[PDB]
Design a protein around this ligand. Structure first.
Ligand SMILES: CC(C)[C@@H]1NC(=O)[C@H](Cc2c[nH]cn2)NC1=O
Ligand SMILES: CC(C)[C@@H]1NC(=O)[C@H](Cc2c[nH]cn2)NC1=O
Ligand SMILES: CC(C)[C@@H]1NC(=O)[C@H](Cc2c[nH]cn2)NC1=O
Ligand SMILES: CC(C)[C@@H]1NC(=O)[C@H](Cc2c[nH]cn2)NC1=O
Ligand SMILES: CC(C)=CCSP(=O)(O)OP(=O)(O)O
Ligand SMILES: CC(C)=CCSP(=O)(O)OP(=O)(O)O
Ligand SMILES: CC(C)=CCSP(=O)(O)OP(=O)(O)O
Ligand SMILES: CC(C)=CCSP(=O)(O)OP(=O)(O)O
Lengths: 410, 410, 410, 410
């Protein structure tokens, strides 16, 4: 019995060779992950056809040997920023993946700001599931945080120095229902650089305007307070922050404020995890015990090439609920330049301690089948990229983010 | 939840508009049938993608208003000759469909004999399922019964008078396993017209040569005897005969000899059903009781336009087993020019008498969902085309053949 | 020797059947026009491939029998708003065509404002000719006059009453050089309806801001004066006005202000042609003599169905030069609901009087070859749509606009 | 002004990525050659679209790094066997190219004999030019010399030892008229290996049968006599012989018998060039003086890697005219494993001696623009493959055959 991705690659007609190459790289990874976590074959077919129809045509050029064709500059290797599996209690596992929608002529004089690809992906996905994409939050936040083509082209001298001219990132939560929840991330770096306004101010002003004109509670007081301090700016790269929302009914959606911090201790990490004691409770302590566990387990081990850990790179989101005044943190450990073996051992020890044996086996199956380089090459550095840790009232919430184009780098 | 054909038509990229139009006509029919008989969604996706990849590109031009584009002449309306559901005991139901593979330029000076389309379909299907298409029987019977392009073009003056220059028909048994069994039919009319040899002789000589060079028992004595008589030729249109084989291991395949007969009584029908008393047993009597039942039930009712039944059009196959000397008949009643309502009532009465209530509901569901014209238009004549009746040792074996392009004629 | 459109339709691979159908309708028309006016075969191939690559994929659904698939409402029949041939002295003839870029899912919940198609066309055309599309004027005028998707979706209640939610129209001057000059038209009806500001004010404020931030002279004083009067509004449908610019270096581009007027006399027509005596000179008088000639020649003749001419429908542009303070008028007579025979006779008499015999034969050749319905059907009403008249210092400037999808309406 | 291949690659939609890659390799070469020899842009577009539509889809997989995807074995690198420019007197230059039509699944269990691709190419080309492909000669010679799929699959044990299971090669003479003359080559190695008959016998029996059933004179007496001798077989690899015909009206076509010979002297070369003194006259002597000139000029120079010339590899055709009893030779020197610089110097010296300065500059332009590796790499071995020499009554006839996929090997 062939697998959905094999059979589909056999039958599917592709509009461009780059789509076929992206397919050959990614469809096995995504399918193996969905299968290992237990998605039904109906659902695998539907999600792989979403990937074929809506995502891959908006993924951009497929890298050649010298990457002479990647005209859209990025610190991230071409392709999805990540494919992720989130593990919770009750053997709950969801597949997700993030893409910075890149057009095929982005970075060229015709699309110097990559303005259409996210919109094309939105449109195609909405056609594939009418009623699955609500553009209310997108329509409010796009003018404020995002920069259109015209504005970016008039104000080019202001932003040409920026290496990654990203303005919209799109993630798909590929649900076990064959439903794909779209999530939009806006890095407002271009907005700030053109308006010479601060990230904090534009983001939270957009949030407050949405509050006003929607009647929904998105409490950002604590986040703004913490993020405007100077002790935070000492470690924070606030220019690396972004705003995320689920593209749904604003009453069922969220707002999330992301920022990057290069820290050295778990005190500086608790600083971001609790916004300076402003957030407290049992969930905070449980989540930070998980954080310290994975910190000691991953960042204690040595790096490749005997390189020293100058500091530890973390990202952080604070999630604001449209129903309540409840800021909840999610801490991302960056592990892209660590040993995939040590990362996997840390994940396995964590799951084992939490009683998640099924998740251990799912993670190992995904590693073995979809990321063979982890065992073939003992000095593997390309598969795993991020570990997200959170503690909801449901329990722990651990997302493992991997590079599904590691094949390309090995 | 969308259906596989809806979602696929949304996502699938088609190489030609005619493929898209054929899809819009046929995918709902085929999917509704597969669903009603209980095929899993995995299997529906796989079979609809076979239809999209291998079949529809070899179905030919999609008819316009005036059919100015159907350059390949045929008595059958463009598209599949039939989509069929076979019903047996134990609530067993299989979906099948028959296509005369027509190229897009067949009947034009470039492909005046339609030589490649069957081969293209064979190749594509074999790629989609390596090991599912055995070409042994095809390779033996193609030179004998079929005519290649070169031979047909040198000997054109001999066959240009033929209206339907068909040489290969291909049917797919779309199994509940998502496996597609390919069956090949060869009408040797062109072979006979060029060699001015008799159909009987070329067909049974090919059968005997396969016997010799394979060591398999295909007893054609009784069939040859019956079909060479003159009383048979009085009713038989032997020039309408053809040879069918399943494209599998010859030891697991069959050979089937088909012929057309326009008869007037059930005595002349028993003549073909038993080869003149040569075939006998309980299966023969049971099957012919079913035949008489459906005869009285369908051909007694009046025709549209008050037209009189000059005679009754039947086809007949005799199936020879590669294991035994066991000729088994299958009798086809032609109902294309009858009332679909009376045909459906006959089918329902038959199933009810046999104790097949699930099959009654499956047939009615397929009629309602995939052939709405049967209820919308009380004078419906386009959906149902054939009723095949047989009695295997397993029990009755009744196949309902419908025109899945009835949409086009209504 | 086949023609470029025949051979290309034979070889070209189309992404969608609608593109193939649009091709079958339009490529003969466009090719016949380009050929009749004398474009080299190299140029015909290049322009037809532009049409195949950039235009037709952004033309929208191809109308079926009942037009059940045209979800984007418009008073204009689906397809190009016009294909035009402009005739000047010296046997100068240029081919042009106008398209309202419509996406394939425009008017549906996924693209309710048709936001991407014009941008996709711009991008594709810029890729096909890097340096041929300057977005400076587009980037300045798009935020002001045009409405993005987000704004249109937040402010939907304000504009849902509008039947034609058009915001960007794109014309291509297909030059004899195989260069395609892109021209962008913005109808600011949505901008005005959302901001409840007047068309005059938003348009001329955008023009003045471009003046300021570009240092180019675009004198709109006379146009604003005339268009804000009340006597003008008595006849003018100012809500039908739009702003056009050539997508080039603003110093080599133009600005043009278009408005519709349903008038009854040539006094009311001179009112628009001279902005109320504000524009004067020999060019004005010559051009208006041509206007009166064609008025008497076309609108004197009777209509089909014996319907009476309630009034005469004209459009008008005033062209402002980036170099000088020189407003120049161009008057459009609407002839869509006249007899194509009388329109053609008027055109021929005009050309003959002007000494344009080559143009007479070019026009008759285009009528005969690309619009046969004009002779086949004596009561032809679908081919010709507009006659534009102007008198530049070079001489007369007469553009004949035709519906290149008349095939679809006959 | 872009070139036809650049613009077309920009606009053309490709059915498969391999077609796009083959295009990127070959369209510049073919276009540069056609342009350098003076084909009009109309003609370049038409021929490149033939290449895009009919040829490249039947060229087969595009080789990856390790050629893991070339499942169809061949001594020749994947792609065209050659692109050629023929030079004659009067500054006459014609572009040609040869392809062994390979399907995309040839060499796999579904197409183990590559049976359809030549037929698909024939059909597509005939559609692109109805009346340009006459299948009379093809229809007569295909059953005799070529092996169909069924025969090759029944008789597999007889031919599986053959490395190159080629049966049909197709060349296109891309005329300055934008007309493409198709030429078919049949290597009957499979026919002989299955029938265990000699190449000579099957080929000349097919020729004699065509004579009989056509009334055309194809004198093969001298060729048969020479090729059946034993002294010839001492040097001749008769199993490497093939039969060529132009796919036209047999009265305007030719028959050509090709064979390979690895010789050591020009006496052994004259043996093939004159069939052992059987062919004589001034043309023979002139052509062989040209042959000796190029022999001394090319095979005297040393090889790369200091490897010794064991012997010199030549091919030879004898052309029989459907009008006369006139066998004419054409001698092919193999130069694939020589220095491209010495080959080019020999060609240039030859042309110069013949007074062909325009041809010298055309050849140098093609080398510089389409084969830059010849100057970039002084040790170039991949561009030039063959030099054909003949002396018709018109004068010399020198064809330079190059590998248009040298890019892939450098
Ligand atoms: C790409 C963009 C500039 C911005 N920056 C980031 O670092 C993260 C990337 C990421 C994916 N999964 C975990 N982290 N997301 C973003 O949207
Ligand atoms: C089409 C061909 C000439 C030949 N003739 C026929 O009548 C039947 C058609 C058929 C399909 N299902 C039931 N009957 N089959 C054949 O192969
Ligand atoms: C379509 C749009 C609303 C707007 N309105 C019009 O009437 C004209 C149409 C037109 C095409 N060629 C001559 N006249 N142009 C426009 O841009
Ligand atoms: C490929 C086939 C087996 C056979 N063998 C050959 O050697 C030549 C190849 C060739 C191309 N141009 C000059 N020589 N042609 C053929 O048809
Ligand atoms: C996805 C990129 C753009 C940032 C990392 S965050 P993630 O959101 O994918 O995880 P969650 O939705 O918060 O569950
Ligand atoms: C299918 C056409 C060509 C003839 C009617 S016969 P059928 O074979 O489809 O039915 P069976 O295989 O005999 O079961
Ligand atoms: C083209 C539509 C949108 C309006 C009619 S005006 P036209 O501009 O095509 O003619 P000109 O450029 O003014 O020459
Ligand atoms: C072309 C391959 C198959 C063999 C070399 S011969 P060529 O025929 O291309 O040259 P001519 O037609 O003889 O002019």
């Amino acid at each position: 019995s062939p697998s959905p991705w094999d059979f589909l690659g056999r039958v599917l007609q592709f509009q461009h060779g780059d789509h076929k190459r992206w397919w050959d790289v990614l469809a096995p990874v995504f399918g193996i992950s969905m299968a290992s976590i237990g998605y039904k074959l109906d659902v695998q077919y539907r999600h792989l056809l979403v990937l074929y129809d809506a995502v891959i045509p908006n993924m951009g050029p497929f890298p050649n040997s010298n990457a002479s064709n990647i005209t859209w500059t990025s610190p991230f290797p071409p392709g999805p920023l990540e494919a992720s599996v989130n593990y919770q209690a009750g053997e709950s596992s969801m597949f997700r993946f993030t893409i910075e929608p890149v057009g095929p002529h982005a970075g060229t004089p015709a699309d110097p700001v990559n303005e259409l690809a996210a919109k094309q992906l939105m449109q195609r996905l909405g056609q594939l599931q009418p009623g699955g994409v609500d553009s209310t939050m997108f329509d409010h936040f796009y003018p404020l945080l995002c920069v259109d083509g015209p504005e970016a082209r008039r104000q080019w001298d202001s932003i040409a120095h920026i290496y990654h001219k990203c303005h919209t990132v799109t993630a798909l939560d590929m649900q076990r229902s064959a439903a794909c929840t779209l999530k939009t991330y806006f890095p407002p770096l271009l907005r700030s650089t053109i308006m010479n306004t601060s990230m904090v101010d534009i983001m939270f002003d957009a949030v407050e305007s949405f509050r006003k004109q929607s009647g929904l509670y998105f409490d950002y007081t604590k986040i703004k307070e913490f993020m405007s301090e100077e002790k935070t700016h000492e470690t924070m790269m606030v220019d690396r922050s972004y705003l995320s929302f689920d593209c749904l009914d604003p009453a069922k959606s969220r707002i999330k404020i992301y920022t990057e911090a290069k820290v050295k201790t778990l005190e500086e990490a608790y600083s971001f995890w609790s916004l300076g004691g402003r957030l407290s409770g049992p969930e905070i302590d449980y989540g930070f015990k998980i954080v310290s566990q994975m910190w000691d387990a991953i960042y204690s081990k040595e790096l490749p090439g005997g390189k020293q850990r100058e500091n530890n790179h973390i990202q952080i989101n604070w999630e604001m609920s449209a129903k309540d005044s409840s800021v909840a943190p999610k801490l991302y450990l960056t592990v892209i330049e660590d040993y995939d073996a040590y990362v996997s051992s840390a994940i396995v020890d964590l799951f084992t301690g939490l009683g998640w044996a099924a998740h251990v086996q799912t993670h190992k199956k995904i590693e073995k089948e979809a990321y063979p380089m982890c065992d073939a090459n003992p000095q593997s550095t390309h598969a795993y990229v991020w570990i997200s840790l959170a503690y909801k009232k449901t329990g722990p919430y651990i997302t493992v983010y991997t590079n599904p184009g590691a094949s390309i780098l090995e």
